Design a protein around this ligand. Sequence first.
Ligand SMILES: OC[C@H]1O[C@H](O[C@H]2[C@H](O)[C@@H](O)[C@H](OCCCCCCC3CCCCC3)O[C@@H]2CO)[C@H](O)[C@@H](O)[C@@H]1O
Ligand SMILES: *C(=O)/C=C/N[C@@H](C(=O)O)[C@](C)(COC(=O)CCCC(=O)O)S(=O)O
Length: 259
Amino acid sequence: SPQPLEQIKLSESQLSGRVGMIEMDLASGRTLTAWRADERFPMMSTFKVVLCGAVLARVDAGDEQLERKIHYRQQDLVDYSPVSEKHLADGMTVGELCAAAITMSDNSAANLLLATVGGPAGLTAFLRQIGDNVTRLDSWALPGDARDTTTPASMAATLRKLLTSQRLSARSQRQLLQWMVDDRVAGPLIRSVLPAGWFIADKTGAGERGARGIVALLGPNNKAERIVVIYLRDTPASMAERNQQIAGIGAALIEHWQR
Ligand SMILES: OC[C@H]1O[C@H](O[C@H]2[C@H](O)[C@@H](O)[C@H](OCCCCCCC3CCCCC3)O[C@@H]2CO)[C@H](O)[C@@H](O)[C@@H]1O
Ligand SMILES: *C(=O)/C=C/N[C@@H](C(=O)O)[C@](C)(COC(=O)CCCC(=O)O)S(=O)O
């Protein structure tokens, strides 16, 4: 592989789209690689991590419990509900909802959780509270449309704040991390192509006009050493090719880790 920056450029050339990327030390926030890091990209399903960060903040505050069972009706389901569609009779706990939202990208689960935090406005106020003045959720992907967007730099900083600053309790930090470790959409596939010793936790996203993304923890020696945030937008490429390009940026990181 070429150097990370060289590969990121090759990916834009090959995809005819914009790539946005930041590689950041999880413990300190040291930024190693930053490309279009202040440009806006659609968050897609990656918002579900921030959502559950807000849910955990309510738990910490004593205004929510992960045990609490939510009952919902079939009429409340939205498109793509692989887990939530199975519990019309018995409901799901708030904690189960977050697991389903993060690990399966369950949209009904995310929708039910979003209500509990005051909707898109409420989640955006949560972001402003933790010092993210850029990321915004507006909805329960055209150029010029800033709705439901973040930047690589903002998303990386926010993920670091949620996982490591003392904004969430120790138990809540550990919970948010474990949900990302447990990703079923891409986690196991990623492990299958990762060399031995490499840690992965992640949340993926996909959307219109080629939108595709991942927010992840990666490192050698089985450690969550770095946050890596990669977003793509405005490419006509197949899903398979978008995946391959993101994987190629991963390969360049892996080969050239010591920077
Ligand atoms: O010298 C480093 C390594 O080089 C190769 O490993 C390859 C691997 O065989 C391939 O499967 C992967 O593809 C990259 C797949 C990563 C996909 C997910 C990455 C995510 C994670 C973080 C967010 C961005 C993308 O690249 C590495 C580096 O060339 C050798 O196979 C391996 O023995 C060796 O230890
Ligand atoms: C989150 O990014 C959601 C992406 N797409 C879904 C949506 O718009 O709600 C779909 C239903 C596809 O969802 C999946 O394939 C599950 C994995 C999505 C993910 O990577 O998180 S829609 O067809 O695009």
